[PDB]
Amino acid sequence: MRKYNGYLIDLDGTMYRGTERIDAASGFIKELNRLHIPYLFVTNNSTRTPEQVADKLVSLDIPATPEQIFTSSMATANYVYDLDQNAMIYFIGEEGLYKALKEKGFSFADENADVVIVGLDREVTYEKLAVACLAVRNGAKLISTNGDLALPTERGFMPGNGAFTALISYSTQVKATFVGKPEPIIMEQALKVLGTNKNETIMVGDNYDTDILAGIRAGLDTLLVHTGVTTVEKLKEYKQQPTYSMKSLDDWKFL
């Protein structure tokens, strides 16, 4: 009789920034667990494995298993697989995306690949990018895991996944299909894994532009936390608003 019987919890934005927010997330997730409400965590992150992420969450007293961690690289693999499980894949990426593809049993190829998947690779090279371009010009579909142009690090803002996709897209004059937030594809793929119905599922996050917009676009109800007077006002000016806006996870009632 709950309106919401499945929860997609965002891992990104500033959801877990500082001790108060961590404790709020711990209390919230533990309550979901107590009520036996299924949930999945969703992230664009491509530098950590499901196992690493779950291990970190548990260390923060936020209950999670590796199977509850769902990334944009997993969504990408899964989406492609359902469309053609016999496609030969060329990818640019790291262990996370490689693992997601491995799990789907793909065959891999270079210049005659059927699908080119672009993810972040912090050891990318001219030749790796060139093979992507040649495969696209040989008719490969062009898919990008995420769209981020820059990535904040210790050193500053480094080149992001989306910047590499722009290079390939410009060179080849082919537009990419993007999977990760703020696109809806990641959220449809997450719904598949979570198993609940779209109209009985809610996405919870605290960033609108990148994160909650994905849920909105995917046709899910959304809870945006960590809002204030000014941000609520601002979103009322946009085409789409979150379903609910609150100060804290502590304020959510399990409707």
Same-domain check for residues 133 and 16: no
Same-domain check for residues 59 and 127: no
Q: How was this model experimentally determined?
A: X-ray
210: domain range?
1-83+180-255
**Which of 158, 179, 200 delimits the end of a domain?**
179
Q: Is 181 known to sit in a ligand binding site?
A: yes
Domain total of the chain: 2
Q: Is 10 known to sit in a ligand binding site?
A: yes
Q: How far apart are CA 80 and CA 119, in angstroms?
A: 14
Q: Please report, for residues 80, 147, 184, the alpha-carbon distance to residue 218 in angstroms, rounded to integers and kept in the order given.
A: 18, 17, 4
159: its two tokens? 């080149």
Same-domain check for residues 69 and 20: yes
Q: For the residues of 6-19, what is the DSSP string, one character each?
A: EEEEE-STTTT-SH
Same-domain check for residues 161 and 195: no
Q: How far apart are CA 115 and CA 112, in angstroms?
A: 9
Burial 141-168, CB ≥16 within 10 A → b, else e = bbbbbbbbeebeeeeeeebbbbebbbbb
As a dihedral over the C-alpha atoms of residue 169, residue 113, residue 84, residue 200, rounded to 10 degrees, the angle is -40
3: its two tokens? 């309106």
H or E segment and range at residue 152: strand 150-153
Same-domain check for residues 238 and 164: no
**Which of 149, 179, 209 delimits the end of a domain?**
179
Same-domain check for residues 109 and 62: no
One-letter identity of residue 103? E
Q: How far apart are CA 248 and CA 225, in angstroms?
A: 5
**Which of 179, 212, 228 delimits the end of a domain?**
179
Whether the CB-CB separation of 46 and 94 falls below 8 Å is answered with: yes
Q: For the residues of 38-97, what is the DSSP string, one character each?
A: -EEEEE---SS-HHHHHHHHHHTT----GGGEEEHHHHHHHHHHHH-TTPEEEEE--HHH
As a dihedral over the C-alpha atoms of residue 232, residue 24, residue 181, residue 214, rounded to 10 degrees, the angle is -50
Instruction: Give the angle 170-165-152 at the CA atoms, nearest 5°.
Output: 130
Q: How far apart are CA 11 and CA 71, in angstroms?
A: 10
Q: Is 192 known to sit in a ligand binding site?
A: no
Q: How far apart are CA 83 and CA 229, in angstroms?
A: 44
Which domain CATH number covers 123?
3.40.50.1000
Whether the CB-CB separation of 217 and 183 falls below 8 Å is answered with: yes
The residues annotated as belonging to the active site are: 10, 12
Same-domain check for residues 195 and 73: yes
Q: How far apart are CA 206 and CA 117, in angstroms?
A: 28
Same-domain check for residues 29 and 3: yes
Q: How far apart are CA 63 and CA 56, in angstroms?
A: 10
Instruction: Give the angle 174-146-80 at the CA atoms, nearest 5°.
Output: 70
Q: Is 156 in a helix, a strand, or coil?
A: strand
Whether the CB-CB separation of 187 and 208 falls below 8 Å is answered with: no
H or E segment and range at residue 202: strand 201-205
Q: Please report, for residues 5, 7, 100, 165, 194, the alpha-carbon distance to residue 2 in angstroms, rounded to integers and kept in the order given.
A: 6, 12, 33, 42, 17
H or E segment and range at residue 224: strand 221-224
